[PDB]
Amino acid sequence: DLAVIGFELDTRFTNTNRRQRGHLLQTRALQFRHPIPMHAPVTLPMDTM
Amino acid sequence: GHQVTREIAAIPFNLHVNNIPFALEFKITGFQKVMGETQFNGKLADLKP
């Protein structure tokens, strides 16, 4: 019991009619924001007089 | 059939072909185990009873 039963091809179209447009490219942009805090001070005391 | 869009597309036409049936293939791993570890004195330590 030995025979070829089936096959597969690598056949492809020639999409000269744009049947397939494939993947898409689009512009994107992301935005990040970094606010700057105040920080605790250092103080020098001295006499007022 | 219900929307119009401008489609700018690039259609590649090319082939890669191999000529010669020769190759020599290595799979190389273990860089970190050799360079990040003792390879000689650790083995002498393992001989300690």
Method used to determine the 3D structure: cryo-EM
Cβ contact B8:A25 at 8 Å: no
Rg value, chain A, Cα: 36
Cβ contact A14:B11 at 8 Å: no
What lies within 8 Å, CB to CB, of A15 at 6+ separation is B11
Cβ contact B10:A24 at 8 Å: no
Please state, in angstroms and as integers, the Cα–Cα distance from residue A32 to each residue in A12, A35, A38, B39, following that order. Answer: 45, 10, 20, 47
Resolution in Å, one decimal, please.
3.5
CA distance A12 to A4: 23
Max Cα–Cα distance, chain A, nearest Å: 116
Q: Which residues of A touch B7 (CB under 8 A)?
A: 18, 21
What lies within 8 Å, CB to CB, of A20 at 6+ separation is A13
- Map chain B to HEC letters: CCCCCCCCCCCCCCCCCCCCCCCCCCCCCCHHHHHCCCCCHHHHHHCCC
Give the pair of three-digit tokens for residue B47: 């001989």
Chain A contact probe: residue of B11, B13, B14 with most A CBs at under 10 A: B11
